[PDB]
Symmetry: C3
Subunit: 271 residues, 3 copies
């Protein structure tokens, strides 16, 4: 399915099952297919599951402009309104934690029953003057430099720390191939602009707007989005938030810890 | 090209050349590109060739519902209607043998000149009470179990027994890579639902409704769809059906025996 | 973005940034993504960049008919008129040199500010009776023969002389994988018809019609489109054309010599 965003960008989405809606927002250099197992799992157990390809990724159009969290958050508002969704549970992975958060911050929680943050960049990823513990901006400047020379090899090399293969996680060549294949569908522009977006956007104001039950899940072996300065802090900043830490789990834990995640999501939805 | 099915599912198809129409229905984790060499072969020789991506596969939309043979068969009826095809030769490979059989059973053969069943699951694939010789439903349960853990590696491992590379067939890395790339386009949901469909759907009633010239071709080294309990029996159950057995040919014989197949299809059309 | 050609073929394109327009025409078995670094480079520097997938390639539809240079030139004409582009700089790589030349020959240059021919098949590629220095036509017949047996492995094997990997150039596995992935999106029919087109089409008449500033760039280690009988001659035949020869550069020099190309495009635009 597709809908057309305010600026005319066509966004691809899947809308599966029937029942209370669960809307998934993918990570960086991925697309809606990253969620296929969670979607099948929940939609087979009486839920409606929705997942979109962020502008510039997967099967969506690739605009030059609007590759920023305010627009990502309004793309989500437009999807929710296109489907007239109610009592939605929002699930964001990695950079996708940011746009579900920003959606709540910009539009309020009237349509939202709950929030899940998975290996998420929230509440802030990069360094700020009052957050020297964040990731130094040099690190992200280097992602960009490498992407603007050879994004295909950057993606391939990124699989190892993403999935924690270099620290004894076991992920098949098939998954690594599918990950590269989907990432190559994305716009070069959107891939680079997203670095800018997740490196510098401060979601701490958003945390205080979150007035719905929230579950934060993060792997403490995450080599991409450090648990100590993201998930751990998000869980303290969001009122009433629950935190689950997957022991030694990598960033790419929706694959390495799929069954555990499916079960925790179902548990949260049934709370 | 695309048309929209009754439930709103957008279906991708190609329509090449001019003349009497030949309509192709692809096998399981594949899409319309599996037929590209037969399409080029016949369309350069005075035929019009049409092939679609089944719902949930390739470039088609991925509905949660309708992943069953009555719907697949009605999808084909809608394609035929959309293009207003007359005197069509239907060609089904593997699970696609089932939806062209079911189309004729559901809609009659007034628009149909002929039928070709290639490595096809017809007349019945899995066991029934009067069909213990079928494939045991636990084999299909295991496909599903592995798909629901890691479909990408499942597809990659499927190449060897699909093409018979484990039994001395020679297929390039390029073809193996293309097979995996197309398979990853598909929906996880449709991939698993098709197992249920081809495992349990009985096309024996359908065979009695086939009243057009029919050619059945099967490899007797087919490791995926056993010749003895499928193609051999379909050729006996369809009145006037002709049978060709490709000696030691694997399941993926549209690749390994491409030239022979082209020539057999051309000879059938020129009967 | 998409537009629909006169004959109903949907053609995919990207339209990035704002300012004076620069429209890119890709080579053979590639798509608009081959331009992504040049597009980002220029659109970040005050230009509008447009690139389309040639009919039968990448994300465009796959028509059986119209796979010839006159039609390719008319697709470009419709895109330009569709967007109402003025003072456009046309940039063609390899076989895409021919369709931007043919656009000017067929439609004149009222909308055109400048022309860039990169590793281009212009002014003619294959042998003719007055051009025995051209590539013998049996070389192309053999391309076609191999394509009609196994295009996936042909593409895979083509990467080495395309990028000059067999001759001192260094290109990552990621880039080779992305090249193959994009190439497999294309139509078998379009891939083969394009060989006929670039093998046999004479653009020498077109050269005398080019009445705008023109830059020819070619690698002199080009194993696919030999500099001496193409780019070298094109720069002599077009009045006032500038020639830059990249030393030891292969055919795939938008990859191996990306920065140099970016800077030369920018210099040409600002001349
Ligand atoms: Cl660094
Ligand atoms: Cl744990
Ligand atoms: Cl012949
Ligand atoms: Cl040089
Ligand atoms: Na990510
Ligand atoms: Na199959
Ligand atoms: Na080329």
């Amino acid at each position: 399915s597709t809908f057309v965003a305010k600026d005319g960008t066509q966004i691809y989405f899947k809308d599966w099952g029937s029942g209370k809606p669960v809307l998934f927002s993918h990570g960086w250099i991925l697309d809606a297919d990253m969620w296929e197992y969670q979607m099948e799992y929940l939609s087979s157990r009486g839920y409606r599951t929705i997942a979109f390809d962020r502008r510039g990724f997967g099967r969506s159009d690739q605009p030059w402009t609007g590759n920023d969290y305010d627009t990502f958050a309004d793309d989500i508002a437009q999807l929710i309104e296109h489907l007239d969704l109610k009592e939605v549970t929002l699930v964001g992975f990695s950079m996708g934690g940011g746009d579900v958060a920003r959606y709540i911050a910009r539009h309020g929680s009237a349509r939202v029953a709950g929030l899940v943050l998975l290996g998420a960049v929230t509440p802030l990823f990069g360094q700020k003057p009052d957050y020297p513990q964040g990731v130094p901006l040099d690190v992200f400047a280097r992602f960009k430099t490498e992407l603007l020379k050879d994004r295909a090899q950057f993606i391939s090399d990124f699989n190892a720390p993403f999935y924690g293969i270099n620290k004894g996680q076991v992920v098949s060549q098939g998954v690594q191939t599918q990950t590269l294949q989907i990432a190559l569908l994305a716009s070069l522009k959107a891939t680079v602009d997203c670095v800018t977006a997740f490196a510098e956007t401060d979601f701490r104001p958003d945390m205080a707007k979150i007035d719905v039950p929230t579950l934060v899940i993060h792997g403490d072996g995450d080599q991409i989005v450090p648990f100590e300065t993201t998930g751990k802090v998000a869980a303290e900043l969001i009122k009433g938030a629950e935190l689950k830490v997957y022991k030694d789990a990598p960033h790419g834990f929706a694959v390495t810890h799929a069954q555990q995640l499916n079960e925790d999501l179902l548990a949260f939805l049934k709370r």
